[PDB]
Symmetry: C3
Subunit: 175 residues, 3 copies
């Protein structure tokens, strides 16, 4: 199965959904889904001594402006390997601009992680969590001479709305 | 190739067989094969501070009561990544009951691991190995309020018999 | 997609090419591509207390004497997981004989690794790098009672030529 096209989004979508992990928490390797083959590829090694603050990936059968599936940061107890998928719930939305282009990130938790599965909204997290996440996106491409503007975090409902828009766009795209 | 259906069991089956690893030795992540897609998914993060004592997975083209392929714990020098497969020999059988349902585990070694490949039966292992394995299955779901009864370990021939029954059942299932 | 047949070699071939990683830097597990299924398998655990000095893999849609795709060692800042691919440039060739049979290795860098991407030829590397690599291949099968002769390293152009010969051979093979 191709992890973008062939993996279902999950019965609970847009609220609860499968996430295919591309990058493990703690990684300095920016892996990404290769859209054509469905394999995981090295996009680059990060240009700064920074690491992903959480497991990171995309939602199957979704589609955004940048012509990729929608991006998700998944907060949980443990690192998850690239190419594996998990079930997550959206708890917040982080709007950002990358080189003048819209690139929002979904903040999620894994609903099968007994520590984090009860979380419904980013306001419940230690405020520091959010601070670190924001800083990561402001920093991670700085040494590439690329500009990344991150805006104020938004509530779980803003993220569910984004996930829905992305499901609709994928559906129109499939022909 | 789908790792359950498309990977051969191996010429030496039931004695020697391919094992597709789902969980790496030392992991607190309970990954499993997603039957529909053939991808590896996060079933859950374990509810206790316990880790898998050995690499863990399933045998291709086999089928048991729980409608999964037969489970295998593979004892060897090194951790093996989820989604990769290896060649193993069955050396013992661990019968257990999980929530009133039969769920036996095969104890195996990797025949391509120069340290362990000579082993033919679990009686050769340090007795502690077996003690730890048993305890792991008695403990690992305890914090989920689920009951796991493990019985006395059985010899290599009992495991080969189980593997055979599971090959037969898979064959009847494929239609 | 099957990582040998279905992944493109890359527009820049023979100079720049996709590499599918089989073994991570630091590993004592000799994983290899299973040609039939496209899955990653444990060929063996190394018989010595040695580890791969760099990420290691093969080039898609190529073919050599041993009927495998051409082998590549990729020098970079970070470990890369088996089954993922990256873009590399060939910077040198290491000729060797394994049990009386030709088995040359390509020395490459990852062109998406900001530290190493500028390298064009092995003469630029610390001489020790090359010394360690050579020794690894002379040592890694010694405890299997197998003989491995490694010869003097050769320049980037010798490696590009090898990659080209291997692309031609693959093309003739596909029927
Ligand atoms: Na994106
Ligand atoms: Na089972
Ligand atoms: Na080779």
């Amino acid at each position: 199965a191709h992890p973008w096209h062939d993996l279902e989004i999950g019965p609970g979508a847009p609220q609860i959904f499968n996430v295919v992990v591309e990058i493990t928490k703690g990684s300095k390797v920016k892996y990404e889904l290769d859209k054509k083959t469905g394999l995981i590829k090295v996009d680059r090694i990060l240009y700064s001594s920074v690491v992903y603050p959480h497991n990171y990936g995309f939602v199957p059968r979704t589609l955004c402006e940048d012509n990729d599936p929608i991006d998700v940061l998944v907060i949980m107890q443990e690192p998850v390997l690239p190419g594996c998928f998990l079930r997550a719930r959206a708890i917040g939305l982080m709007p950002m601009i990358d080189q003048g282009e819209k690139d929002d990130k979904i903040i999620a938790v894994c609903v099968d992680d007994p520590e984090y599965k009860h979380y419904t909204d980013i306001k419940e997290l230690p405020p520091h969590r959010l601070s670190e996440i924001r800083r990561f996106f402001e920093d991670y491409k700085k040494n590439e001479n690329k500009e990344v503007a991150v805006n104020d975090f938004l509530p779980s409902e803003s993220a569910v709305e984004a996930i829905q828009y992305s499901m609709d766009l994928y559906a129109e795209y499939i022909l």
